[PDB]
């Protein structure tokens, strides 16, 4: 039975975790309303990936790699084939170089579309969650054309370039999507920037300065929102 | 049901409230046992209003003010217990005998 004590109450966030970013376990402790300590218990999905890679060839490993960043997919196959193509000096054909850039930029659009769905549900509006997966199935069917799977498990990046070239009605099918989707990026920006309740949930909430966000070791849009302007594509 | 049977109901509902007022060891159960006394003076009061002076109810008006006093006496009454529980971390009426003599 439960008692009402004056100690700081510690609650367990649970590894059940009904959300769309996996399984954490936060033993956060409360002091009435403000939390005072929080430990992340991670490792619930450690399938032994660095021990697999010591007993695989490269072309046996590219199906394994699109499961680390499984929101993205072929962002992880880019690093794996770039381990010996940047080491054995295998030259990449320039058409494959521009083919990779199309896939890696289509993944980053599908990456930020999986973050945005659950994030807008966490901070408020719950009905734009279903109108965002509707925009994600257009990127899936474009990957489904060139590669044989939707978002992960597409052995598409090779050590010598890319696996195979695109389909036929493909470049005119981005130009439908990637000129329809760009009016909607300006639509999601007006949900949070306007409507002065959501900026009363995000102004000053989880702040970090520049010098500690470089010291803690941060990259991507956690680092660039700390005023750093370090992007590895330009660097 | 006549007038007499409401009064012996009210006179019995009073004396269970008395028995809780004196024997109870939780500091909050004395407050619930006080509220039994402030209902027995209501069950006496409406029952005096239905059979006596039925045309102009002077008892059911007086029955309204007893509820509002006892609701204001239990709002004050639990504020006191909640001031004690932050100092003395128990609620035990056999622990508040420090002003003895």
């Amino acid at each position: 039975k439960i008692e009402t004590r004056t100690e700081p109450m510690v609650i367990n966030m649970g590894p059940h975790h009904p959300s769309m970013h996996g399984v954490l376990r936060l033993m956060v402790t409360l002091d009435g309303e403000d939390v005072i300590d929080c430990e992340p218990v991670i490792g619930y999905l450690h399938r032994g990936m660095e021990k697999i890679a010591e007993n695989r060839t490269n072309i046996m490993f590219i199906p394994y790699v699109s499961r680390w960043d499984y929101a993205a997919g072929m962002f992880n196959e880019a690093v794996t084939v770039n381990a010996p193509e940047k080491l054995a000096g295998i030259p990449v054909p320039k058409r494959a170089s521009y083919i990779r850039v199309i896939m890696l930029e289509l993944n980053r659009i599908a990456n930020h579309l999986l973050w945005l769905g659950p994030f807008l549900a966490d901070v408020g509006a719950q009905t734009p969650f279903f109108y965002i997966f509707r925009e994600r199935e257009y990127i899936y069917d474009l990957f489904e054309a060139a590669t044989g799977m939707r978002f992960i498990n597409n052995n598409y990046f090779r050590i010598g370039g890319v696996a195979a070239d695109l389909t036929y009605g493909w470049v005119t099918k981005c130009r439908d999507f990637c000129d329809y989707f760009l009016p909607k990026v300006d639509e999601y920006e007006r949900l949070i920037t306007n409507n002065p309740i959501f900026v009363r949930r995000l102004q000053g909430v989880g702040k970090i300065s520049r010098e500690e966000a470089i010291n803690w070791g941060l990259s991507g849009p956690m680092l660039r929102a700390s005023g750093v302007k370090w992007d590895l594509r330009k660097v | 049901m006549q007038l007499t049977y409401v009064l012996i109901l009210a006179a019995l509902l009073f004396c269970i409230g008395i028995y809780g007022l004196v024997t109870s060891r939780n500091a909050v159960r004395v407050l619930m046992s006080i509220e039994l006394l402030l209902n027995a003076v209501n069950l006496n009061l409406i029952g005096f209003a239905n059979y006596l002076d039925g045309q102009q109810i002077k008892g059911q008006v007086f029955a309204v003010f007893v509820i509002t006093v006892a609701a204001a006496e239990a709002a004050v009454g639990l504020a006191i217990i909640l001031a004690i529980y932050r100092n003395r971390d128990t609620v035990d009426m056999e622990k508040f005998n420090l002003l003895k003599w």
């Binding site: 039975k1 439960i2 008692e3 009402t4 004590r5 004056t6 100690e7 700081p8 109450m9 510690v10 409360l30 002091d31 009435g32 309303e33 | 309204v64 509820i67 509002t68 609701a71 204001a72 239990a74 709002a75 639990l78 504020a79 909640l82 529980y85 932050r86």
Partner: protein, 100 residues
């Protein structure tokens, strides 16, 4: 004597709606196979402001029903009751009582 009219169906409907859970939970009974809350005094404080304002509502219901048969002097007198218990409401906001 019982000169209330309309309460003949209230005793029957009290039993039948009480027979909605006790029979359905029996109709299902034949077909089926570090513990701390913190002592935060806001659960009490939100409930105290209810009792002071659940009683104010009760006192205005004889006024609201029998208003247009009383007049203006019973509106000046019933305005003192509301205007004082507004000062009870401003006291609750300002002293951070109902803050949560």
């Amino acid at each position: 004597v019982f000169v209330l009219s309309g309460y003949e169906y209230f005793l029957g409907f009290l039993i039948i709606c009480s027979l909605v859970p006790v029979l359905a939970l029996a109709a299902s009974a034949l077909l089926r196979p570090g513990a701390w809350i913190q002592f935060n005094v806001r659960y009490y404080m939100f409930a105290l402001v209810f009792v002071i304002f659940d009683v104010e509502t009760v006192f205005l219901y004889p006024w609201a029903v029998a208003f247009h048969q009383l007049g203006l002097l019973a509106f000046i007198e019933a305005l003192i009751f509301i205007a004082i218990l507004v000062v009870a409401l401003v006291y609750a906001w300002r002293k951070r009582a109902l803050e949560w």
